[PDB]
Amino acid sequence: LTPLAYKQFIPNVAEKTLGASGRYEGKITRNSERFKELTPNYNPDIIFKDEENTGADRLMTQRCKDKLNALAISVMNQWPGVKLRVTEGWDEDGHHSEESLHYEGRAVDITTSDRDRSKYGMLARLAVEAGFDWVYYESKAHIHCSVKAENS
């Protein structure tokens, strides 16, 4: 398994295409009826920064909960004592470029537990093999993953 390169993404297309994570549905606010499609994620083998204290980093769509939990296993298996860490999940306002899949609970910004950036690329690969419909080596500080909606 050869880790993803800096600023590389798979598939090699835009995030919101049929081949990728799919078109943007809309902003899923709290008072929005579609909110209940976002259930919290309590996988003990995952570290959520939750710097907002709101626990919004755990809220995600079913498909995302599947890919994530599947990725959290690869991580522990790849590097002993190293778990999957999520810094950002579903957001409730400006913090990402509008039309973002973070507003829908379809996107997750992840890193390793030890923050050792040397594996951020291998993590991105394990994400692609985990099933995520679009993994992107966003920055040197974290990788960005996203899935499709129930509309697939």
Annotated binding site for Zn(2+): 102, 109, 144
Q: Tell me the binding residues.
A: 51-52, 57, 87-88, 91, 93, 102, 109, 144
String of contacts with other proteins for each residue 93-122, x by CB under 8 A: --xxx--x-x------x-x------x--x-
Which CB sits closer to Zn ion, 75 or 136? 136
Rounded-to-integer distance, Cα 3 and Cα 125, Å:
5
Helices 120-130 and 62-78 cross at an angle (nearest 10°) of 130
Residue recorded with tokens 């993994």: 135
Residue 100: partners with Cβ closer than 8 Å, 6 or more residues away: 91, 107
| DSSP letter (8 states) at residue 50 | -
Nearest-approach distance from CB 139 to other proteins, in angstroms: 5
Q: What share of the chain is helix, strand, coil (3-state, %, to 5)?
A: 25, 20, 55
Restricting to residues 73-132, name those near Ca ion by CB under 5 A: 88, 91, 95
Q: Does position 138 bind other proteins by CB under 8 A?
A: yes
* Minimum CB distance to Zn ion smaller for 72 or for 90: 90
Task: Check binding of 87 to other proteins (CB under 8 A).
Answer: yes
Q: Which is nearer to Zn ion, 23 or 77 (CB)?
A: 23
Is-contact 135 124, C-beta < 8 A?
Answer: yes
Annotated binding site for Ca(2+): 51-52, 57, 87-88, 91, 93
Tell me which residue of 7, 29, 10 sits closest to 133, measured CA to CA: 10
CA distance 86 to 50: 8
Q: Interface with other proteins by CB under 8 A: which residues? A: 5-8, 49, 51, 87-88, 95-97, 100, 102, 109, 111, 118, 121, 138-142, 144
